[PDB]
Write a protein that binds this ligand. Structure first.
Ligand code: HEM
Length: 153
């Protein structure tokens, strides 16, 4: 359970991300695909991309980064009361997209890295710890839905 002070740190940096949702979404997906190439293989939509320059040039990838970050921002702004938002996301990611929880840990690392690069003054260690707690809570709740459905592993 995050404290109110922890949530304020999370949402303070997130309000900065929202100034350039698409730039952040590109940086995060590119970091994820470069750091963990098994993740790119889950996207029939993107698996033709073979270089970072091709990734940066793809408008469709930039569009999907906005989709992703808009869904994450709506979950963070619920401050833990996010059951309605996680149901469809866990369902699609477990049963249609076939995304292991571990890959959610990988995109969490990529989000934290990109927030640290772009917002260092609002992403000191206190805010890094709070964002890690928020993303851990996200993963915990999704993993419980995966387990229900027979996909936790
Ligand atoms: C912060 C974590 C994530 C969020 C908020 C998120 C959100 C979304 C949303 C909103 C969609 C479109 C609606 C839907 O299908 O449910 C989507 C699609 C998808 N996501 Fe995620 N996602 C996350 C992580 C991941 C990861 C880590 C992977 C793969 C390693 C992944 C793979 C996919 C795939 C394959 C699609 C379908 C893309 C397409 O062909 O249109 N997602 N995601």
């Amino acid at each position: 359970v995050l404290s109110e002070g922890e949530w304020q740190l999370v949402l303070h940096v997130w309000a900065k991300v929202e100034a350039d949702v698409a730039g952040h979404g590109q940086d995060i997906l590119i970091r994820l695909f470069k750091s963990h190439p098994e993740t790119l293989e889950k996207f029939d939509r993107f698996k033709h991309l073979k270089t970072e320059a091709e990734m940066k040039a793809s408008e469709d990838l930039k569009k999907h980064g906005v989709t992703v970050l808009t869904a994450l921002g709506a979950i963070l702004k619920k401050k833990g009361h996010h059951e309605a938002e996680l149901k469809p996301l866990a369902q699609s990611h477990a049963t249609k997209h076939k995304i292991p929880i571990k890959y959610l840990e990988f995109i969490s690392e990529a989000i934290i890295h990109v927030l640290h690069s772009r917002h260092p003054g609002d992403f000191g260690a206190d805010a890094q710890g709070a964002m890690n707690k928020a993303l851990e809570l996200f993963r915990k709740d999704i993993a419980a839905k995966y387990k229900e459905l027979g996909y936790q592993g």
